[PDB]
Each structure stands twice: as structure tokens, then as C-alpha cells.
């Protein structure tokens, strides 16, 4: 409310896992949709 | 009419609004601060003209080019080919002195997750590729956190904010190369292959990521993009030199009293925004030795230059030397700067990909030959063979990288030839 | 050195014991299915990120599963993993201390902190502690080069560093507590150290300037 | 009905679209030097030899990957382009090693016959080479690392010609090294072929290894017959005695390949 600028609130990195960023990747993926496909399964295919 | 001082930007007129983190970096936050607003009626305007807007604001590549950014985004207006198209944010951020990327990333997600929907909506793009380095996994990790909540918020994925467009923001992660700021490099690397960069007689718009067309841009570009948009070209375009327009963020290091970053008008005087938003280099303006503008790619430039020279492209170009990426480097006179570009050219060897052979080679070779220069185990003529090495290795390189190694010892040499010359004579004296 | 040739050796050898958890595995086809079909290749850089997590190092066998799960010549895994740096393919320490040394980072004396890594630590640039905890390696810029000399601890930057706020990190990794990410002294993360020279007003909400039609 | 008129040092030439600025200059005739670009394998364009001037650009295109457009005059031997090549040489004949009278490429070498023609005929490199740990791939091509110019040729005839994908690269900078990384040998009916591909002595045949010099023997024209497809080789014979067998170009029934029970 005061327009507090003297304080930082970007710590909620601190509590970041290794997994944190694969793991947020995961449950995301429902809300993408059908990827492109270009036919043959593989280039070697 | 026309203004003269370019400088002292407003606080009004600012794109990134939360450069160190006052304010609240998600949804809610970004909102509170103009961002993600209005969006459907962008999008709805139509492609062309975000493109012609673009074009009027003037916006030059922020990346550490300087093609215009509306000619470049321009250049996939083309038709549909069944090959989907595809947008990519550069945000490997390798280049030494940079650190604007990394800020906007972790402090103003949403501005560029609304970069990303704008620009492949301009561009016909059927999702987004934001490729940020391995390093910043904290950075990543927030990105991805303010890409969820505009996800759930419906802003991008199916239905883009109601208008009808479908696109998705992927964020690739690096793995540790300074190469992979290259785009064509970042885009094999996306591919799965190494970062080596590829030649471009075909051109991203034509042939990118998995062979469909893909356009890399860089962070700040397409994070103003929407502010572009909203604000309109023209505000842009006020700011700034002309065919200089627009407002950069200064990344402000080395031997400045308050390193920091400042988000500042183009063709600002380099004396004010060091005394101003950094504090001066340490020592005073008289204790400054040597200044590199733009990152390890542009060459350094002395003091004597660094009286008078605004920050824009072709005023630093005037200067023999290039704006690049924005990254302040001072050095003051208790620098060895022999020293600080041998450092640089190590630096340059250590992420040189391999791939043509005046890079590979001929960088090595640079190291070596400034390793010596810095114990002054030479004589004058290797002094003029580093010169005919660096000019051998401009032009004839795969990508940029050569060049931008080549382009410190051309800076150093031309600047500082007594230093090398007197160093190299007291090694002889020494050596009796 | 880092020698680009994979000798086999009893710890690390084709048989060496390595898989991937299950979550992993759900991880692995997630991240798989982020990239367009018949291009299953974009995904070795991410996977094979991934089997570093839950092993810490690359064995030649995590190289060999990686390239069996993403259906790709072994070579082609190999040749981005030697390529990349933050691939680890010899073991590491559970801390790997890299310090940027290039030259934005070097003229404010990060050798004054390498130093005092190499004191506390009594581990020569390039080692590993007996102990196994801490690995001091040197790295080129990792970005943060407005600020002081940072260093980079796994997965943590540590910026604004002076030889005694490391001498407080170091010794509180040795006890397990985790030091607090972000510069080691007074700036949040890349103000001014003297002030705010910038966004003193509140930034103006939902519409300002916004042009007439948009 | 699609032909693009093109200049090489001002005669003006017919070429079908898409046409590299390197064919177009063996249309003249001028063959233009390069060693990473091979007419069977895929354009890599990182030799960086084939680094030509294009009249009115400044700016030496790579003609071994870049297509030709209307009105281009390719001025092969313009001082920029001798410069150029000059300089991309001394760049390849930095780190080379001093081997050529141990070499087997010695006298058929492609480096050291564009170094006689387009290269300089001395040297301003005054510092330490660097050297490569030799590695193994079989009985039949027997490597010597530190004379490779990382062409990357083998690995794209591994990759395409044998199907086989065994063959990369490791590392960047000048410590990136082609080759296996682990330890397999390059097993394949088409693997000797490698060797005629690597154009210095990286990669030479281990039966002829150390036993004929290129300019001493006798070239004759023949016919395999291990095989029922009948590629044409050449026995070169010193002597009166067999010492290897090279593949003879016919572009239908062997192309310029030959098997290794032929070779
Ligand atoms: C060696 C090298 C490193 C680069 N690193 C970056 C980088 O870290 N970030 C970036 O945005 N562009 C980088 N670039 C520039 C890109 O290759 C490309 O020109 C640019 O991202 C295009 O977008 P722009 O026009 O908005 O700058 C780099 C270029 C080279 C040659
Ligand atoms: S200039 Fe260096 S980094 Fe760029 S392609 Fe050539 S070898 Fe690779
Ligand atoms: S490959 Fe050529 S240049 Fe190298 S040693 Fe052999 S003959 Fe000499
Ligand atoms: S071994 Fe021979 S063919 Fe293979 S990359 Fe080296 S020089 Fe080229
Ligand atoms: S120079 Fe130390 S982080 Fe970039
Ligand atoms: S032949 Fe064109 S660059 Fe190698
Ligand atoms: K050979």
C-alpha cells in the first residue's frame, strides 16, 4: 500500500529444489497443446 | 522541437518498471504496473500492424547487433508453407559484462512472456522458444513460474487472451556455452546437436529450429515489444538519436564506484551516465584509463574519447568501436590493460566452438601471443603480426565470434601500442 | 585438462550401475513431449541435464541410457556432452565452487576471493577436498558482472563477495546450512550501492500513455 | 527457361538455380581450393578455404555453400581472396605437426600441394604446437590425430556414405578432436574409404602404411573383381609388385567408393 520500496520480494527462489524447474516443466505440459509432426519419427527413420 | 542532451530519461517513460525487484514479479504485480493489459485488442489489430508500429518506433536489435528490429521481424510476414513457424528469445547472455537479461528475467517474467505472445503473433509464430543459459536456473525457474500463472490466467496457450491465437512459450535451458548466443548456434543446440554455428547463405526466416522458420530475438527487444505497442511508436521513437531511438539498459561495471544497471535513453553522454547513475569511476573522471562499451565483442576505447561520445550505435561506431550489448566496462589507471584484454582473449578461446579454422586457430594462436605480450617476452614486429592475425581472423569466420575476438586486440593495439611497447622493453632490460 | 577421451576405468565402464527414478522417467517424457514430433533429439540437452541430478556426474552408462532413451546414436550423446561445459562426465564434489574470473569480474580482485577458497579450503584451482564436499574450478563470466566477485555454488550465485562473506559461506556449507542466495552485502541485486537513481514514483498502473486506437 | 547468368573473373556463365558458387567456377574451369568440401559428402563450409571474393561485397563468401544470384562476378583472384587464402592457410599450418617425411600422405598430400600453390612460403608462428593422443578404430586405418585439420569429412561420410554414426567430434576450441570418444572400431564394408576422404595423414592405410612414396608408382587402370557389382580401380604398382589398390571414379557403378575386401 505505501509503495514500499525499500524492501526486496523476490526471494522466493530462496526455496528452489533441483528438481524445481523440470518439476514446474511437468504439470505445465497439460496446458500445452498437440506439438507439430513431421511425419517420419526420426530423421534416421 | 528536436532535443539535443539526450538523457536523464523519466521515470514515466520506462519500460521495465521492476529492475531490482520492488515490486511483485507475478501476475498480480505485473498487472499493477500496466503489464498484460489490453493484449486482445494487439492482438486483434493484426499482424502487420504490430510490424509497421515496430518499424516507427525505430527499435534496433538490443542483443548486440543493430538490425532494425521491425525489418527483421518483418521478414516472416510471408505466407504460410505448412512448416509451422517458430519464435525464439535469446537469453544465453554470455557476453562479459552483460547482466540486463538476467534482471528483466528475474524480476519482469510477464513483460517478456507478453514479448513472446506479441511477437509470434506479428510473426505468425506457433509457439516460443526461450532459450536462457544453464547457469540461471534460479532465473529460469521464475521464468517458468510467472509462464504458469499466465497460463492458468489464460492469457497465452489455446485462445491467447481471447483472440483466437494459439501459442506456447517453451524455455530451453542451456548447458554452459558461450557460442550458444549465437543464433544460429542456439539453434542447433535447441536441435539437440552442439552449438556450433551454422553458415547463413539460408537464413533463419527460410530454414531454423528443426528446419521450420524461427526468428531469434533477443530479451530486451521483444520485453519492450509489448510496451511498443501499448505506449505506441512514436513515444519510442522521441527518445533517443534518430535511427537511435529508444531506451537501453546500461549494465555499469569494472571500476565504478556503484556498479549497477540503469535503464537509460539511447545516445546518452557516457560522462553523465557515469557520474550520474554509476558514481563516477573510481578515482574521479581523471583516474578513468579505459573504457569498453558494449561487452568483450567491442573494442575498448581510452579516455581521451571517453570525454565526449554518446551511447548510441553510430556514434560509438564514429568512435572505432561498437554500442554492442550496453555493458559499461571501466578501467582506471591501476589497470594492467594488457593484462584485462589477455584475460578477454582467454576468455575467447575457452568458448571459441571449433567449428571454422580462424577461430579455432587463429584465437588460440591471439591467446598465446597476448599471454606473451603480457610478461613482454616479444619484440616491436609481433606487435604488427597480432594485427595482420586479428585482421586474417575478421570476415573469414562462421559466425560473429572471431570477429568479436579479433576486435579487443585491434582496440588494445590501436590504443595502447606504447604500453605493449614499453612492457616488451623493460622485459629486455630485465632479461640481461 | 579435461581430457576429451573416455578411458574405461572400473567406476566408470558401460556396466556401471545407472537408471532413471520413475518421476525422472515422467519427467524425461514431458520434457520429450516439448519438442515437435520426429525431432526427439531437441530433448538430449534437457535429459541428460536430468540424469546429472539424481547421479551428480555423467557415467559413460547414464550416456548410454540417455541415448537408448532418446533414440539416438550414442556419439551424437557424447559429443554434447564433452562439448558442454556444465556436463560433469568425471565425479565432482557436492559443491562445486566455480569462480568467474573474466575481466568485468576480475578488476574488482576476484583473485582476493579464489585465494581465499584455496586457504579455507586447502585445495589447489582444478581439485576436490578429500571430504568429497567442495570443488574450486575456474569459470568463465556467468553473468553477473555488475556485481562484485560472485561465485557460483551448484545451483546458487553469490554475488557482492569480499574474502570474509565467503569464509562465512564456505563454513556454513561445511555445517549444511545453506547460505542465503543473492550479493553478500547491502544492494538486493543490482541497484546502485549508493542510492536509487531510477523508479522513485510508483510505476503508473493499467493504461498510461497508451496510444488512442490500440 | 530457369538459367541465371553468373560472372567468374568476368566470362559469363549459364548456371541452373541453386548452383554453389563453387561449381560455377569449375564451369570456367578454375577449380577453387578447399579440404572440407567434398561433391559426394554435405557442404560443412568450416575449412574456410574456399573463401572468395564477390565483385562490389565486401565480404569473402564461402563458395563451397553459397548459392549464386544474377549478375555476381566471382573474382577468384583478387588480392582479397589471395589474402584470404593466405591467411586461412597459415591458420591450418599453425598446429600442424612437422611429419611430412614420416607422413604417408607426403607427396599426395592435399595441405601441402595448396600450400605450395595458394599459401605463403614462410611461416610467423613462434610458439609451441599442439598435439593429440592418437586413437584406435581397427586393423585398417591407422590414426594419427595431430595431423588432423578437423575437416570433419570423416564423420560425414560415416554419417551418410556407412550409415554407421560413430564418427564425431570432442570438446571445442582447438582441443576439440575427431574421433570415437569410447573405444570402437570404425567397422564397416565402406570404412577404408575414409582414408582416400581425410585429405592429410590423420587417417592412412595400415597395410601400405610405410612401404611406397605417391610419385613412384605406377598407375594402372582396372577392374575389381572380389565383388559382382565391378568397381573400377587402380592398382598402383612399383617394382613389379602390387602396393595398394585406389578407387577409380565411374559416378554408376562404384561412384569413387570402393569395399575393403577390394581395398
Ligand atoms: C558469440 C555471440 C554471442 C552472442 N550472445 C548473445 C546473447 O547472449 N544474447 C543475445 O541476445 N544475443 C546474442 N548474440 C547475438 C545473436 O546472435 C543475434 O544476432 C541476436 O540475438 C538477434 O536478436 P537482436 O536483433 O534483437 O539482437 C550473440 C552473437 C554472437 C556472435
Ligand atoms: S568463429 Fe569460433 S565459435 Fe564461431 S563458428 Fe568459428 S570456431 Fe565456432
Ligand atoms: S598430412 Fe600433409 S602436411 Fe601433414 S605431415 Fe602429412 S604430408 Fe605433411
Ligand atoms: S581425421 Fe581426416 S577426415 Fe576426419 S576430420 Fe580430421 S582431417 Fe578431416
Ligand atoms: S565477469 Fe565475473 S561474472 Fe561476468
Ligand atoms: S570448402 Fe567451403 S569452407 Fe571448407
Ligand atoms: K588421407
Redesign the interface.
Known sequence: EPFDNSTYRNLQHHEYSTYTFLDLNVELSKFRMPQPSSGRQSPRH | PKKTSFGS?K????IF?????????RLKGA????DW??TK??LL?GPDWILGEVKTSGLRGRGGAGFPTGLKWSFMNKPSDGR?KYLVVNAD???????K???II??DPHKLVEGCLVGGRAMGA?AAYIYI??????????L??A??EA??AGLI??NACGSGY?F?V??????????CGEETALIE???????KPR?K?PFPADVG????PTTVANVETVAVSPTI????GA?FASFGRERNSGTKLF?????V???????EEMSVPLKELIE????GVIGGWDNLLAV?PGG?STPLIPKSVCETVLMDFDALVQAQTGLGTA?V?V?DRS?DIVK??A??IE?Y??????????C??????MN??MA?FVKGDARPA?ID?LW?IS???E????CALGDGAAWPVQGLIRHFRPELEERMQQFALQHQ | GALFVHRDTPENNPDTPFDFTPENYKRIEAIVKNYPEGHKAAAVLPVLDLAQRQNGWLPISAMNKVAEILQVPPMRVYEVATFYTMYNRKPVGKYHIQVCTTTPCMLRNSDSILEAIQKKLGIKVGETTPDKLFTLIEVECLGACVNAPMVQINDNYYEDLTPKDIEEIIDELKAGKIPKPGPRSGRFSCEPAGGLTSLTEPPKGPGFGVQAGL | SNLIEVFVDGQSVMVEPGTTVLQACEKVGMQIPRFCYHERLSVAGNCRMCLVEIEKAPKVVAACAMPVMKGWNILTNSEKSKKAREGVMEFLLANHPLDCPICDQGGECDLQDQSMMFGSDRSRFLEGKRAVEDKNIGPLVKTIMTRCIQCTRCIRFASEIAGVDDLGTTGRGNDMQVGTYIEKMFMSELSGNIIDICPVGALTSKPYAFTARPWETRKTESIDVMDAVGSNIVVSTRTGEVMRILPRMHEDINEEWISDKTR
Open positions: 530519461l521515470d514515466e517513460d520506462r518498471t521492476n529492475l531490482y525487484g520492488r515490486h511483485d514479479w498487472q499493477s504496473r500496466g493489459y489490453k485488442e494487439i489489430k509451422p547472455e554470455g557476453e562479459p559484462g552483460t547482466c537479461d538476467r534482471e528475474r524480476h506457433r543459459r544453464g547457469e540461471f536456473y534460479n532465473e529460469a525457474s521464475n517458468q513460474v509462464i504458469r497460463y492458468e496457450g489455446k494459439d506456447d517453451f524455455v530451453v535451458r542451456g548447458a554452459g556455452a558461450y557460442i543446440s535447441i536441435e539437440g546437436k552442439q552449438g553458415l547463405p529450429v528443426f528446419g521450420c505497442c501499448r505506449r505506441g513515444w549494465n555499469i561495471s569494472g571500476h564506484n556503484h556498479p549497477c544497471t540503469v535503464e550520474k547513475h554509476a558514481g569498453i568483450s555493458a566496462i578501467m589497470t584485462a584484454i584475460r578477454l576468455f578461446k575457452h568458448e571459441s566452438c571449433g567449428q571454422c579454422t580462424p579455432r586457430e587463429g584465437v588460440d594462436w598465446k601471443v606473451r609481433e603480426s595482420e585482421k586474417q581472423i570476415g573469414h569466420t562462421i
